[PDB]
Amino acid sequence: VAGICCTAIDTTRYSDRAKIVGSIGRQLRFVRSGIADVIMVDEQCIRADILEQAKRTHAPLIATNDKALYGLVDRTDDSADDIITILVSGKEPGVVILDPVKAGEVAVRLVQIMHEKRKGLVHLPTDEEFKEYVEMCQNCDANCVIACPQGLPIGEANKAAAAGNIEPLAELFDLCVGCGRCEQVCKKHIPIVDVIHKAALPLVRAEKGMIRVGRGPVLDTEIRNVGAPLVLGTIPGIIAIVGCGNYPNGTKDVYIMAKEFVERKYIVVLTGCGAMDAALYRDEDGKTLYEKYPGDFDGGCIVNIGSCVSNAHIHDAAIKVASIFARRNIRANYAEIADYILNRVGACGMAWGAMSQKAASIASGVNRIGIPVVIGPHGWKYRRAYLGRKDVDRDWMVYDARDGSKVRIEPAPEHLLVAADTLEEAIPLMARLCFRPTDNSMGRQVKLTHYMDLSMKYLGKYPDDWPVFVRTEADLPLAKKEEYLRILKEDYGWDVDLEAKKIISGPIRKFDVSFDATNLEQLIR
Amino acid sequence: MNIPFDIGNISGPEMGRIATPEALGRAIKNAKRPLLVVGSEILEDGLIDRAIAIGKKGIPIAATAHSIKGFVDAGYTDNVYMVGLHELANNIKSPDWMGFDGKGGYDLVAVLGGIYYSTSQFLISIKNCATDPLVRAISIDRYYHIAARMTFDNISRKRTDEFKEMLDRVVQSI
Amino acid sequence: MNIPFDIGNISGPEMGRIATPEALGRAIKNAKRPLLVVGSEILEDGLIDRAIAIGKKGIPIAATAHSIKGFVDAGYTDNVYMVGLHELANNIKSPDWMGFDGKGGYDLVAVLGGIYYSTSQFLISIKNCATDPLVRAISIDRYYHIAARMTFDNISRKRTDEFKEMLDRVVQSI
Amino acid sequence: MKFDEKGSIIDLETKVVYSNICCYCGACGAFCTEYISYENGTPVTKQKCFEIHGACFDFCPRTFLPVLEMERELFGEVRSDWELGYYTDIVTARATNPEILEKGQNGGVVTALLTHLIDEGKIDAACITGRSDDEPWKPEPLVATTRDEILKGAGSNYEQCPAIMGVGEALANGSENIAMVGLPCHIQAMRKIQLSKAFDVGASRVKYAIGLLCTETFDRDLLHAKLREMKIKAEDVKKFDIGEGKFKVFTEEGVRTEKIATMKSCMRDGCKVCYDFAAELADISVGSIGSEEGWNTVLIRSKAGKELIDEAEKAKVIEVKPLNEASIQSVKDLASRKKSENMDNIVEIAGATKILHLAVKPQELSLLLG
Amino acid sequence: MKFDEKGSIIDLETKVVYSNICCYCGACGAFCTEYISYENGTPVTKQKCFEIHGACFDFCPRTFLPVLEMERELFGEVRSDWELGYYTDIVTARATNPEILEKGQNGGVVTALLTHLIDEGKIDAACITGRSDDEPWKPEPLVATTRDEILKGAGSNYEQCPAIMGVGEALANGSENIAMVGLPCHIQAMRKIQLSKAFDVGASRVKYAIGLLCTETFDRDLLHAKLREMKIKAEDVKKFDIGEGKFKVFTEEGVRTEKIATMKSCMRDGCKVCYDFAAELADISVGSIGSEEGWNTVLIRSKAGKELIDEAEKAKVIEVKPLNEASIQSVKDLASRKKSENMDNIVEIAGATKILHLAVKPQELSLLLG
Ligand SMILES: Cc1cc2nc3c(=O)[nH]c(=O)nc-3n(C[C@H](O)[C@H](O)[C@H](O)COP(=O)(O)OP(=O)(O)OC[C@H]3O[C@@H](n4cnc5c(N)ncnc54)[C@H](O)[C@@H]3O)c2cc1C
Ligand SMILES: Cc1cc2nc3c(=O)[nH]c(=O)nc-3n(C[C@H](O)[C@H](O)[C@H](O)COP(=O)(O)OP(=O)(O)OC[C@H]3O[C@@H](n4cnc5c(N)ncnc54)[C@H](O)[C@@H]3O)c2cc1C
Ligand code: SF4
Ligand code: SF4
Ligand code: SF4
Ligand code: SF4
Ligand code: SF4
Ligand code: SF4
Ligand code: SF4
Ligand code: SF4
Ligand SMILES: [K+]
Ligand SMILES: [K+]
């Protein structure tokens, strides 16, 4: 028993004997593979042509939710015996069963029967068929590539295979998001999706990862352990990799983000397709992230919160930090808690492949409680974003709750909902979006060390405006403190005493450990 | 027939005009404060040499995505600014934004070597929001940018040599 | 620049092609079972004379709206059928529909003298649903019918003289 | 008109402004004061406009110019002479009034005909070109409503004037009968406006289009830089002239000259693709080549043009004489020169020439056609 | 190639099929067996296709044909002779094998060259034309893989064959070295296929394009009506020929002739806009005019064409001798009459010709340029 999309996560949460095939991008390819003897679907993120695809592989379809009936007969009231007879005999390619107990019995009894009847079928192109397909391709200048959301080089890949090199085609399997648009503009009627699959069969069959089951809520003891280091900043932030798989450049990007941040002792949590895709890769010692790191909600740990509905546990963790660690009331007190999270809880979401309407509402609900979100380049297609103007002083004024004075704060977080184009831009951005005005000197120093090192690693240069996050010398990364002090003096014109290793002028604001930052007039004492 | 790289990117009635390389170059030349915007695709096919040649004519470059690395590697970073395409769009449409040198906004924005579907939305933003003062956005890339004011037609990747001849003609016309 | 009568009628990427009057005429000539579709605007500018000239070449007429009144008053009602534009679209895309004479469907549909926004949707129904067997729908009207396969460009009403000159050339070519 | 095209500011910029073939005729700005201004002799807009199609594109002589189609609509005939265009008669002429003959460039024909038209009440405004008293010899449109104002605009200015700006001013100031003077490019724009079926701007009120022969206009900065090389201040230049292969600059102290070839470097870029030497679309075309000193070469084209000269001659405001075949061939020769040289510049910018399915570079039309 | 245009089936129907300028070359059908079929010599589709751009439009010689640009790619040089195109030599030749010589239309040069290529393993398929056994003299593509099949294609068929259908068949059957024979329109399509940068259908495997000289092809219905008027049944016809101002119809009882001008009414409409008499883009072009009975006029064009004639002459499969100047002139005369008369047809269907801003009817081109 294995699943695709979140039902796979929730099912493995019930049984550690089930398995997960993978994310949305893999759905069409797995179904087209014909490995499944029976397909049982419910609702959301299901291929709308799943009846077609099931029929093609001679797998009966069991639909269990009224959101998706596919023209099938509602046999909720029929005996499980009569349903099996109908499906086995083939007079109907699927059925609707809105009674879940009956649906389960039918599926289990039916898969044993179909497993025997489906032996001997072949679903993917053979070697000869594959050869005929790549040879007949006309290497069209602008057909399949134009219909493909990722603009993949299918024609050039086909001709390379016709000339005896299948690597170009095989490379496309992971970049492909299994949408099927390419095939519909091909007059040659090449099953492009299946041709890429055939070329990558070896790697597809070797796709064997390991993922921790959805843990769900964060424990109270974990909130008490990370609360202060998170608010002060010495835990450099919560990195939440979530969302769909409409990635620009394959599924390894989310793995590389999770890996990079866990190695830097961020709290790394994942859900839905993101959590799935990060589990497909193994490091030099052959271990998946979920095998190498603990599942505790703590710095340097990898946590599969669970399915897309489990995202709410991330909100809940930030609320509990305000309630348990800051002793704030939460009962019908949304604004005060959201303002707390925006000013003190270093966190950043990442939906590198954001696609669905559920992904837009997730981002909205995360944004409203004060947590920024980065999305992939396809995210421009949502039309709207929430972007800050770091140059407009009046936009970054917060109140010191001690006396009601107004203080201009560094852009922290600079943006609320922003789309990045490449992994190499996105990772420094995420670190940047974890800065918060209430970071202490050690916490800012931790966060700034990672932001500067990550910027140099992925972009080859320190950010143009990194000094905005420097309030005192103690904020400066320790190993390069003296060089940073010189850079502040000679490249940014700050008044710095290199002899005394002390900054005199330049910072956006003076460091004040007691600065009680809030946006809410009602919190002024 | 003008083919947008994503055939579904038929946004509305005002569609980018096909322009000669010489006309695209003269638009950059006639601009009081032009800006070259490059993306991750500049790191390929020796395209950064053209960006650098444009920059050395006195034109600032917005290096979006992770394109800054290629400039650092190439040894040309003067008047090249690291920025996100997303924030760059919001800043260009903001009349109070004083630009990367603090002297004012940009009247002409030209894109090159950018991921198609994000660059296109960057162009649509300026087309629809940077109206007063008007900011003209053009494309000298290999794609037919229906959302640009002026653009080249689609040039397939297997015909990249043709794209480079046309881009080189843009550079000579600035 | 092709101007759709409703500037907002940018339906998708497959946009109707400007065709000469002779090419539109020959497409009716080459059809095995052409059908002329006229709407309420045929009752103006002596346009029904052109429709009757077409019908008298052996071509059936679908008189939509209340255009049948004009054919009654003109004295030509043979091979002219009263029908609604909506039901007509459903019928043409139905491969089992045997036409007005019961002999089969129509392979070429030409619209003339029709309310723009409803005739356009009539054309888009055929383009998108009459695919196998393929039915070719064209416009010989005064509008740029972006939903037609082939069409004229927009001819404003104050230039109706020019439109009539082209429409007459269509008739000459059938 | 036939072969008309729809277009907006974006098409104007794509095809004319950024193609470097704007000639500064003034037509786009004259009928879009709402958005268009001029900088360095080229139109700009500073705010987005929202017309589906614009007069800027419709009226521009460099977006689409179906010359032979416009010849048939204005003259009832197409040319038989490719060098001078369509004309019924070529004659030399000069004004009879000493004051006009002296202040006029050559023989004062244009000024005489204009003063005649206004004194007979046949026009109430003459859209011509004046001079800035702040910017020396800087040409500016002049809507003349008095025979004095007409004389003020006498003489040649070799810098380009957005003359059509004055036409637009006159068409909005209540003038009911307008006569306009223009170089070939101005005339082209004037005729495009009058023959347009996409826009109505009252252009039927323009009853006379008086064309001037033109080889090229000069860029102001380059021209005045030559005036400094020649040790001449524009404030003291009394007259400009081009003759005997010489560029003449007249001051009280006398006349300083220069080889006309050394001046080609001062020409406007927009003139490089100009294919009209003799103002082929004007009611009449008035020049100096072919005539003697103090006389004007006049080509009669339209019925209105023929009527203007006949009536003027019958009123003794001008004196007309025949011209020999050699003198006519002198005019023809310079036309051919401008058209041959400037076609070479045209085919460098133009896209492929298509004839049904056949497509060729324009300069290779002969290899394909014979 | 340069001046290439993207298009789909709708563009093909708009610009070619419904414009009445399809020449039944067979290219669009050859590379879209999935949708295109032919009815009365024109392509049709019966179900909607979904390609953004199609090979039907790209390969068609009547959508866009940049002949000079194609000449540069194929020969490295454009033409210096308008009537005949680019060529390095014109000779007269005939086959040496008596059986080929008796079966060939004139001297059997084409059959002799194809037989030489297959005998020496230079080709494994010759894409030529044959005759239907059920419909008399109806030409059909012939993919010859034997020297006997090559001989079975000898002789002229004056009805049009969709010959490119054979090239597409050979490219789909595994042939690695292909030669094809074609009328000028077939040659144009083959060259568009080989030079396309929009589609790769493996046409680099076509190694030889042998062109036939052609004045026109005849509509089947009209031609066979003419045969009935001559009281001749098509099944009784042994050979067709056109010579000595006469259309010759050979039967066992003897030869029946008719003045060739009366055959013009039988010509295919698509041939009325054909601007290529001598197969200007072929490797070699083979004809009859200028040569003696039993001999062929052969224009050498490409380097592959030259080496083919030299290697065939060395192998003694053809005999070659120079052609006289008066003979070459007779070839140019027929080319000029075809091109001049059909350009008259071209300009009646062609849209306006545009040269930068200037727009004129193609037929009035010389009034604008002289
Ligand atoms: C730039 C230029 C180039 C010329 N080149 C040639 C040439 O190569 N060969 C040739 O034979 N003749 C040429 N002429 C025409 C010639 O110089 C005389 O203007 C013409 O013969 C009329 O003489 P006139 O005495 O009748 O004019 P006038 O009676 O003096 O009246 C001249 C009229 O021209 C108008 N005018 C002056 N300058 C301009 C301008 N820049 N734009 C528009 N209107 C203007 C004045 O406002 C006035 O109405 C040129 C004229 C100009 C302005
Ligand atoms: C329709 C037509 C018109 C012609 N008009 C002229 C003309 O006006 N002036 C002139 O000098 N020569 C003309 N020719 C060429 C001439 O008739 C001879 O075909 C040519 O000289 C070659 O002679 P051959 O003896 O070498 O041919 P052969 O050795 O007999 O070989 C002839 C080859 O042509 C192919 N072929 C025959 N008919 C067709 C066809 N319809 N389409 C394509 N391939 C075909 C055959 O399959 C064969 O491969 C014409 C040919 C044709 C088919
Ligand atoms: S199925 Fe894959 S290759 Fe095809 S269009 Fe979708 S993403 Fe591109
Ligand atoms: S559309 Fe089909 S034939 Fe064309 S390049 Fe793509 S796979 Fe090949
Ligand atoms: S408002 Fe109209 S005339 Fe004015 S610049 Fe815009 S398109 Fe041109
Ligand atoms: S040529 Fe005249 S109408 Fe055209 S853009 Fe220039 S000033 Fe405007
Ligand atoms: S050369 Fe032509 S474009 Fe230039 S001023 Fe004279 S008429 Fe105008
Ligand atoms: S599938 Fe392509 S080649 Fe075939 S008819 Fe359609 S557009 Fe043309
Ligand atoms: S000319 Fe040839 S390629 Fe073109 S439509 Fe006709 S048969 Fe097809
Ligand atoms: S005249 Fe032209 S189109 Fe006709 S068969 Fe001969 S080469 Fe082809
Ligand atoms: K794409
Ligand atoms: K409307």
Residue numbers in the entry:
A (entry chain A): 265 to 789
B (entry chain C), C (entry chain F): 1 to 174
D (entry chain B), E (entry chain E): 1 to 370
Q: How does the study describe this entry?
A:
Here, we study the molecular basis of the CO2-generating steps of anaerobic ethane oxidation by characterising native enzymes of the thermophile Candidatus Ethanoperedens thermophilum obtained from microbial enrichment. We perform biochemical assays and solve crystal structures of the CO dehydrogenase and formylmethanofuran dehydrogenase complexes, showing that both enzymes deliver electrons to the F420 cofactor. Both multi-metalloenzyme harbour electronic bridges connecting CO and formylmethanofuran oxidation centres to a bound flavin-dependent F420 reductase. Based on the crystal structures, enzymatic activities, and metagenome mining, we propose a model in which the catabolic oxidising steps would wire electron delivery to F420 in this organism.
The structure of the CODH component of the ACDS was obtained by X-ray crystallography and refined to a 1.89-Å resolution. The α2ε2 core of the CODH component can be reliably superposed on the homologous structure from Methanosarcina barkeri, also obtained from dissociation from the ACDS complex. While the α subunit exhibits high structural conservation with the homologue from M. barkeri, the ε subunit slightly differs due to local reorganisations to accommodate the ζ subunit. Each α/ε interface of the complex from Ca. E. thermophilum accommodates an ion in close proximity to the [4Fe-4S] cluster 3 (modelled as a K atom). In the structure of M. barkeri, the respective position is empty, suggesting that the additional ion may be a thermophilic adaptation of the enzyme to optimise the stability between the subunits. The C-cluster operating the CO-oxidation was obtained in a non-carbonylated state with the CO site vacant in both α subunits occupying the asymmetric unit. The ζ subunit is positioned at the intersection of α and ε subunits. It is composed of a ferredoxin domain in its N-terminal part (1–83, containing two [4Fe-4S] clusters), an F420-reductase domain (84–349, containing one [4Fe-4S] cluster and the flavin adenine dinucleotide, FAD), and a C-terminal extension promoting the homodimeric interface (350–370). The anchoring of the ζ subunit to the α2ε2 core through its N-terminal domain offers a structural template to picture how the electrons from the distal cluster of the α subunit (cluster 4) will be transferred on the distal cluster of the ζ subunit (cluster 5).
